[PDB]
Symmetry: C6
Subunit: 217 residues, 6 copies
């Protein structure tokens, strides 16, 4: 298993909102949407709002294109009791994607669980209570091509903060990952003699990673 | 003595609670439990609560499967007076284990004894007294395989804080080490060209290490 | 694409102010200036003041030399609604340029977006909102020649703070980069045996980079 | 002079207290103890309490075994007037020793004299006066063997703080160095592939080093 | 252009003060001094006081030895309006120079322009205004020779703070640089086996560097 | 000029105090002492107290052994007016010296001039006033030999603070340096396999370095 050959894409445009009245809570979630509009098999959907704590901004996939009962399989399993019975959801389908020219470095900063420390007289050692998990950000570095159409799109997405979707596909394991976040795009290119010029892009997560097989497509 | 060939497992499920009315204090502790349930020889049991200060969250082994008096031999010796006469214990038996795919790096952070400093007009040099010992955290790095069934188990154990049990068996010296702690599992895999993808797991100890021979099994 | 052969020029002199009454907001902006004075095709014009938030100190190039309607093509697109209908802009024409003798190192310091953090009782995790982007400073290092006419010009520009214009041309991609900022010029030369002497220059950015093709000229 | 071949031993057990009424203050101190008990020549005695400021916890060796006058030769010389005329001392006889399996690294941290700084109006430069000397801690790293009997002894010594005695013998110079301190014993073994496992021990110094020749024995 | 062969001298003695009643402000300044005393061509003079803000402690060269109107050509040009009309100046002529034996390393610390930051409610980004420029310090390291007559001179100049003059002449480009500052001279020589002993000298600038051609002499 | 072959000695003992009523202030100082006692040619003297600001604890050499007029030539020249007319001095002669076994590393820490920074409303740049020079300390590292007689002497000098004298002689340049300070002597030897054991000593200056030729002796 090697990461060679993987390529990363970003969202271009999204359609109008679609409302899901009811969601089943087991294995692959099922969304009961009346008169679905252009939701075939294999499309990608971004959840924009919900009342189920998780799954707020996580990208999912539609496997069944039924008229009234859309089954957004994806990865998330709602069988756990953490998600209560009553649940609402709103999602938008993605239209197209654009590929980053030449990624040469991927690095991630963040994570780690924060704790609250206390000690009473009875206690012999200091005790801790978990409080929350810090944020995670990634930086991508790619080559400089001022004619590349990705530059206006990145500039526009940076101008107005919006939770876009990012996809990257690894061919060796036929595995597909998806996440959503805000994009802040630097554009001043660092130049060094006898070395290619590079530009750097940063993403701040708003959800969790999704792992699927490429067979679903 | 070389550490090559050692493999690490984690707890998968545990049985119902078992109560021990009385414990002897010498060499191998003996638990007087009426009508023991499926406590065969070689089993692995975790202590969940007790009033003997130590042994709160330490994993032990039963050697005798007597009807009313099981002998929790383990490693710990309670002969010292530190453990008082009257003592109660509750322990749960472990059912199955799951092995981490490919551990490539093991690191530990923590330890060290904290002191409190003071000085009087009579004293010529600053004096110190011990107060308590800091915590210990362990990190493991293993390869990325999104189909591996260990991922749902680790995600579930990370979701709800629970003091699970971890075991590592070294064949060269025929040692088996057991400890208990909380698991926090990251899942974002770092990628670098011409290098495998890695994921990292973290453990925070809640007890002390146990050293046994593999002959007991 | 290689950066070899690129050369950097600075400002020498600028003409009197020219006022634009009305500005078209789409693709290439058009400035309606009555009786334009010496605004031939290919000239470089720096914006000194405006009421459109952006374009405050960004360098542009004219393509049409019409008597009453000069088209400041540049790169900036005013089609976005961010720029309101009513708008004014004043620009100065650049006369000549002077080349830095021998640039040996280019480095950039700055960037990054600052955030404001808050957390409510209802929120489960800490939330962030962007506030503003930090400044960017560029440094250039070139060889020491005390007879070079660029030295008095740079010293004069450093003495009285003025937002001058800088151009650097990359021949491999036929791309021209322009930006404006303040110049602070150090002149003490560092000397080391068996090594040439160097003098360092610094620029404080005041605008945004403009990327154009060299065919416009 | 090379340190190869040196081996380190620790305390195992000590006898009952023995009281000294009068102490001679010159060269080798002489202790006047009525009816000494099993104080044969070459024995190791650790001082537990005294009123002579120094010699509080410094290890010494007897050379003479007279019925009422034992000579604690050691290295310490009491000829200096710092020790007053009237003096008392109590010491304990050491029974046996235990050798650390395989020391691979010895490191020290501490020392240095702290100062107090002041400056008057009349003074032209800042002046300093010494206050006291900081503490010293030693660390040892040795291989991991869970059957080694030294492990229970070290764990017991760590459990209850006691000022034990440590000896290390260098054969090349035939020199014996002794000191006393508290032992805090870590036991989590660090593991790395293609490398032996190690455990680390720490000692907090409580006295002063004694240098003697091995001919005394 | 290579710095090899350059040698550095320091001031040894200076003459009595000379007062300049009037100074012209263009290109080479001209000082109208009645009955000039021994001001031959090619001489070196340091300015000790003036009311023209700059030129306070900058070393210059006289090119004309006229009876009443000496022309202090130097490097500085007073044509700028920054220097007002009415101006007074006092300068002292230098007599002799002494050369540092063997300079092996030259390093400079200081520079950089300090800013003051503020932000208003109306402003969208933080704004800055310059306040002042920091100082510059130079260090020289040369070989140890206790018989060298330069040592008493440096010790004397260090004892009483005085703004001496320093000159360095580079033969490859025929440049001669002059600056003034205070000298603080360390004398403890660092010793290392199989390496020469070195001593270090430090200079704190009080003015600006002067760049001239060696043809003036 | 190489430092190879240099050896360092420390003071062993000193004689009774000798009082100087009058001192001449020019080149080599001359001390008017009635009925000098055993002050031949070539001896070393330590000034213990004086009212001449400098020369408080600086080692000097006696060249003339006259009955009433001792000429402490040394290095210091009192011709400067800084030393006033009236002056008293007390010095003690040194008896013997002891050599450090094997110095392998010499390092110095300290120096640098401290400044006081202020700025007025009228000033354009921040100004500084020198206040005082920091202290200087040196560390010596030598091999471990527990039989070496220098160890009791160093321990005794460390026990009671005293401004002893240290001398080190460089044979290549026939130069002799002398300084005075307090000695703090560590004795715990660091040991490493296949490496010799070392001990470290530290000195804190109370005076200035003296440079002479070895011909004086």
């Amino acid at each position: 298993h090697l990461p060679n050959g993987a390529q990363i894409f970003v969202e271009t445009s999204r359609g109008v909102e679609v409302e899901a009245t009811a969601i089943t809570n087991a294995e692959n979630p099922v969304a009961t949407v009346a008169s679905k509009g252009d939701l075939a098999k294999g499309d990608y959907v971004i959840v924009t709002q919900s009342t189920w704590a998780k799954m707020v901004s996580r990208v999912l996939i539609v496997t069944d294109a039924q008229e009234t009962s859309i089954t957004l399989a994806g990865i998330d399993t709602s069988d756990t009791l953490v998600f209560p019975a009553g649940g609402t959801m709103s999602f938008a389908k993605i239209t197209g994607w654009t590929e980053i020219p030449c990624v040469q470095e991927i690095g991630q900063d963040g994570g780690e669980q924060q704790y609250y420390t206390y000690q009473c007289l009875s206690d012999d050692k200091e005790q801790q209570i978990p409080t929350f998990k810090s944020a995670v950000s990634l930086t991508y570095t790619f080559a400089h091509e001022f004619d590349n159409p990705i530059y206006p799109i990145l500039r526009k997405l940076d101008s107005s903060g919006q939770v876009t979707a990012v996809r990257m596909y690894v061919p060796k394991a036929s595995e597909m990952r998806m996440w959503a976040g805000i994009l802040s795009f630097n554009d001043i290119p660092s130049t060094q003699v006898n070395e290619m010029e590079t530009v750097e892009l940063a993403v701040s997560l708003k959800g969790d990673f999704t792992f699927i097989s490429s067979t679903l497509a």
